[PDB]
Design an enzyme around this catalytic site. Structure first.
Site, PDB file in Angstrom:
ATOM      1  N   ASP A  45     -45.193 -42.292  38.027  1.00 45.70           N
ATOM      2  CA  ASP A  45     -44.162 -41.798  37.532  1.00 45.70           C
ATOM      3  C   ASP A  45     -43.132 -41.180  38.596  1.00 45.70           C
ATOM      4  O   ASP A  45     -43.593 -40.211  38.966  1.00 45.70           O
ATOM      5  CB  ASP A  45     -44.290 -40.955  36.488  1.00 45.70           C
ATOM      6  N   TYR A  50     -36.240 -36.828  41.589  1.00 48.79           N
ATOM      7  CA  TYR A  50     -37.493 -36.173  42.145  1.00 48.79           C
ATOM      8  C   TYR A  50     -37.368 -36.394  43.640  1.00 48.79           C
ATOM      9  O   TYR A  50     -38.143 -35.540  44.419  1.00 48.79           O
ATOM     10  CB  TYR A  50     -38.667 -37.024  41.885  1.00 48.79           C
ATOM     11  N   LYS A  79     -36.086 -43.358  36.474  1.00 46.60           N
ATOM     12  CA  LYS A  79     -35.333 -42.671  35.507  1.00 46.60           C
ATOM     13  C   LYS A  79     -33.726 -42.637  35.986  1.00 46.60           C
ATOM     14  O   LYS A  79     -33.728 -42.155  37.066  1.00 46.60           O
ATOM     15  CB  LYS A  79     -35.912 -41.245  35.149  1.00 46.60           C
ATOM     16  N   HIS A 112     -33.180 -40.371  31.747  1.00 44.58           N
ATOM     17  CA  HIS A 112     -33.870 -39.079  31.918  1.00 44.58           C
ATOM     18  C   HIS A 112     -33.921 -38.016  30.835  1.00 44.58           C
ATOM     19  O   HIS A 112     -34.989 -37.495  30.748  1.00 44.58           O
ATOM     20  CB  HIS A 112     -33.596 -38.612  33.130  1.00 44.58           C
TER      21      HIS A 112
HETATM   22  N1  LIG Z   1     -38.959 -36.793  31.885  1.00 39.25           N
HETATM   23  C1  LIG Z   1     -38.976 -35.510  32.373  1.00 39.25           C
HETATM   24  O1  LIG Z   1     -37.795 -34.879  31.997  1.00 39.25           O
HETATM   25  C2  LIG Z   1     -40.182 -34.893  32.992  1.00 39.25           C
HETATM   26  C3  LIG Z   1     -40.310 -33.548  33.029  1.00 39.25           C
HETATM   27  C4  LIG Z   1     -41.314 -32.942  33.696  1.00 39.25           C
HETATM   28  C5  LIG Z   1     -42.180 -33.654  34.207  1.00 39.25           C
HETATM   29  N2  LIG Z   1     -42.013 -35.077  34.096  1.00 39.25           N
HETATM   30  C6  LIG Z   1     -43.071 -35.987  34.998  1.00 39.25           C
HETATM   31  O2  LIG Z   1     -44.728 -35.587  34.325  1.00 39.25           O
HETATM   32  C7  LIG Z   1     -45.279 -35.453  35.514  1.00 39.25           C
HETATM   33  C8  LIG Z   1     -46.373 -34.299  35.263  1.00 39.25           C
HETATM   34  O3  LIG Z   1     -45.541 -33.198  34.792  1.00 39.25           O
HETATM   35  P1  LIG Z   1     -45.756 -31.793  35.337  1.00 39.25           P
HETATM   36  O4  LIG Z   1     -44.955 -31.844  36.609  1.00 39.25           O
HETATM   37  O5  LIG Z   1     -45.339 -30.763  34.627  1.00 39.25           O
HETATM   38  O6  LIG Z   1     -47.355 -31.649  35.999  1.00 39.25           O
HETATM   39  P2  LIG Z   1     -48.674 -31.333  35.249  1.00 39.25           P
HETATM   40  O7  LIG Z   1     -49.105 -32.982  34.742  1.00 39.25           O
HETATM   41  O8  LIG Z   1     -48.339 -30.917  33.635  1.00 39.25           O
HETATM   42  O9  LIG Z   1     -49.880 -30.591  35.946  1.00 39.25           O
HETATM   43  C9  LIG Z   1     -49.385 -29.369  35.984  1.00 39.25           C
HETATM   44  C10 LIG Z   1     -50.233 -28.646  37.038  1.00 39.25           C
HETATM   45  O10 LIG Z   1     -51.628 -28.986  36.751  1.00 39.25           O
HETATM   46  C11 LIG Z   1     -52.470 -29.044  38.287  1.00 39.25           C
HETATM   47  N3  LIG Z   1     -53.568 -30.076  38.018  1.00 39.25           N
HETATM   48  C12 LIG Z   1     -53.624 -31.399  38.032  1.00 39.25           C
HETATM   49  N4  LIG Z   1     -54.906 -31.689  37.723  1.00 39.25           N
HETATM   50  C13 LIG Z   1     -55.499 -30.503  37.378  1.00 39.25           C
HETATM   51  C14 LIG Z   1     -56.825 -30.648  37.319  1.00 39.25           C
HETATM   52  N5  LIG Z   1     -57.875 -31.609  37.045  1.00 39.25           N
HETATM   53  N6  LIG Z   1     -57.399 -29.418  36.884  1.00 39.25           N
HETATM   54  C15 LIG Z   1     -56.676 -28.335  37.116  1.00 39.25           C
HETATM   55  N7  LIG Z   1     -55.454 -28.356  37.516  1.00 39.25           N
HETATM   56  C16 LIG Z   1     -54.794 -29.362  37.735  1.00 39.25           C
HETATM   57  C17 LIG Z   1     -51.597 -29.463  38.870  1.00 39.25           C
HETATM   58  O11 LIG Z   1     -51.738 -28.747  40.157  1.00 39.25           O
HETATM   59  P3  LIG Z   1     -52.191 -29.214  41.496  1.00 39.25           P
HETATM   60  O12 LIG Z   1     -51.048 -30.215  42.025  1.00 39.25           O
HETATM   61  O13 LIG Z   1     -52.390 -28.245  42.605  1.00 39.25           O
HETATM   62  O14 LIG Z   1     -53.390 -30.223  41.425  1.00 39.25           O
HETATM   63  C18 LIG Z   1     -50.046 -29.565  38.315  1.00 39.25           C
HETATM   64  O15 LIG Z   1     -49.337 -28.625  39.173  1.00 39.25           O
HETATM   65  C19 LIG Z   1     -44.133 -34.838  36.574  1.00 39.25           C
HETATM   66  O16 LIG Z   1     -44.752 -34.891  37.854  1.00 39.25           O
HETATM   67  C20 LIG Z   1     -43.158 -35.889  36.227  1.00 39.25           C
HETATM   68  O17 LIG Z   1     -43.347 -37.244  36.882  1.00 39.25           O
HETATM   69  C21 LIG Z   1     -41.074 -35.756  33.788  1.00 39.25           C
HETATM   70  C1  LIG Z   2     -37.290 -31.537  38.014  1.00 41.90           C
HETATM   71  C2  LIG Z   2     -37.246 -31.465  36.462  1.00 41.90           C
HETATM   72  C3  LIG Z   2     -37.214 -32.397  35.848  1.00 41.90           C
HETATM   73  C4  LIG Z   2     -38.531 -33.499  35.893  1.00 41.90           C
HETATM   74  O1  LIG Z   2     -39.544 -32.948  36.383  1.00 41.90           O
HETATM   75  O2  LIG Z   2     -38.306 -34.577  35.169  1.00 41.90           O
HETATM   76  C5  LIG Z   2     -36.957 -32.191  34.256  1.00 41.90           C
HETATM   77  C6  LIG Z   2     -37.600 -31.192  33.576  1.00 41.90           C
HETATM   78  C7  LIG Z   2     -37.123 -30.984  32.211  1.00 41.90           C
HETATM   79  C8  LIG Z   2     -36.283 -31.471  31.791  1.00 41.90           C
HETATM   80  C9  LIG Z   2     -35.616 -30.969  30.398  1.00 41.90           C
HETATM   81  C10 LIG Z   2     -35.227 -31.788  29.343  1.00 41.90           C
HETATM   82  N1  LIG Z   2     -34.864 -31.590  28.017  1.00 41.90           N
HETATM   83  C11 LIG Z   2     -35.085 -30.232  27.602  1.00 41.90           C
HETATM   84  N2  LIG Z   2     -35.828 -29.435  28.515  1.00 41.90           N
HETATM   85  C12 LIG Z   2     -35.861 -29.579  29.706  1.00 41.90           C
HETATM   86  C13 LIG Z   2     -35.649 -32.573  32.480  1.00 41.90           C
HETATM   87  F1  LIG Z   2     -34.500 -33.032  31.780  1.00 41.90           F
HETATM   88  C14 LIG Z   2     -35.843 -32.741  33.704  1.00 41.90           C
END
Ligand SMILES: NC(=O)c1ccc[n+]([C@@H]2O[C@H](COP(=O)([O-])OP(=O)(O)OC[C@H]3O[C@@H](n4cnc5c(N)ncnc54)[C@H](OP(=O)(O)O)[C@@H]3O)[C@@H](O)[C@H]2O)c1
Ligand SMILES: CC[C@@H](C(=O)O)c1ccc(-c2cncnc2)c(F)c1
Length: 305
Positions: A45, A50, A79, A112
């Protein structure tokens, strides 16, 4: 370990999240994404926002070169960022992403967020997103993306696309914040009714960025119920939070820049939760979205309350 999409393609049910804050060097995204593929990840992803698509692309191509995986074995997601929602900008933004990553196609292209910005963090704008989706449809017809979906859409915003006069392709997925404290059970029910896959981000709770996440919010992985279930199954709390999504039909992402935790996260396929385990986790829902900032909550198309 894939789910069949509304357009015929398949999506791996565990995805690797690549976002790291700007303070982390971009060379880490290259090393880490190679490790994710080494560990068994096949869903990767990324996004325009990013600032890592060159590294994430090189990581994929590097593993293609060393004979580990084939391109058709990788599910790459990008995205469209919110400054590019006006239809004439949609295809250039996607072509730029393929350019950065040096790929011929993405498996999945997403809008996105529904919160359009002035044509990366400018000021709001007003865009009819049905026209943005139309440009997405042409990107699929042209082969730039095998599948197209949306992200951060609520029920009303999803219905607008599905209700569009002369719609070509329905959204394949809706990538939203989803975890035991904010589990989107009504939105998940609606997505399953329209053959839309819910993809969960921040399933480990968040990266807790001081820009958007209140440090006073509870740490999802320190939750009492998740930790008790981790002890019961001899697993980790993160594996319980990930297995929870798979068993309710949600494709789950997991970011990790740690070699050991990346390898640990693929163990989600090794064990199962019982029906009692699952209601224990369902009882944690408290309408807590970690991303909570006035920049989002002031936008006219803010998906939450
Ligand atoms: N469409 C959107 O708006 C949007 C928004 C937010 C995120 N995303 C995507 O979703 C992906 C994941 O979401 P997120 O960025 O919030 O991170 P996450 O998947 O919720 O993980 C949060 C933290 O958990 C830690 N972690 C990973 N594996 C672990 C384990 N086995 N045990 C304990 N901790 C662990 C990691 O720290 P460490 O790195 O130190 O391991 C990470 O920083 C993002 O990278 C992004 O691609 C999309
Ligand atoms: C870099 C941060 C980025 C990601 O990690 O994808 C991101 C995170 C949160 C939102 C979001 C959307 N809609 C409501 N609240 C928050 C977003 F649009 C984009």
């Amino acid at each position: 370990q894939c789910v069949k999409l509304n357009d015929g393609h398949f999506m791996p049910v565990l995805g690797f999240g690549t976002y790291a804050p700007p303070e982390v060097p971009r060379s880490k995204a290259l090393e880490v994404t190679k490790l994710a593929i080494e560990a068994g990840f096949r869903h990767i992803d990324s996004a325009h926002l990013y600032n890592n698509e060159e590294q994430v692309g090189l990581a994929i191509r590097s593993k293609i070169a060393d004979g580990s995986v084939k391109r058709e074995d990788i599910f790459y997601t990008s995205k469209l960022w919110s400054t590019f929602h006006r239809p004439e900008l949609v295809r250039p933004a996607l072509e730029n992403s393929l350019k950065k990553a040096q790929l011929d196609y993405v498996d999945l292209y997403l809008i996105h967020s529904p919160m359009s910005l002035k044509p990366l963090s400018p000021i709001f704008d007003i865009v009819d997103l049905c026209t943005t989706w139309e440009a997405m449809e042409k990107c699929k017809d042209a082969g730039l993306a095998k599948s197209i979906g949306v992200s951060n859409f609520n029920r009303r915003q999803l219905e607008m696309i599905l209700n569009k006069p002369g719609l070509k392709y329905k959204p394949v997925c809706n990538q939203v914040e989803c975890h035991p404290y904010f589990n989107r059970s009504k939105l998940l029910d609606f997505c399953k009714s329209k053959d839309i896959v819910l993809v969960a981000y921040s399933a480990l709770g968040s990266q807790r960025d001081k820009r958007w996440v209140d440090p006073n919010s509870p740490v999802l992985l320190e939750d009492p119920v998740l930790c008790a279930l981790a002890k019961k199954h001899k697993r980790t709390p993160a594996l319980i939070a990930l297995r929870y999504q798979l068993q309710r039909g949600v494709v789950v992402l997991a970011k990790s820049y740690n070699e050991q935790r990346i390898r640990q996260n693929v163990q989600v396929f090794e064990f199962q939760l019982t029906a009692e385990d699952m209601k224990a986790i369902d009882g944690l829902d408290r309408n807590l979205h970690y991303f909570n900032s006035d920049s989002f909550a002031s936008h006219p198309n803010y998906p939450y309350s």
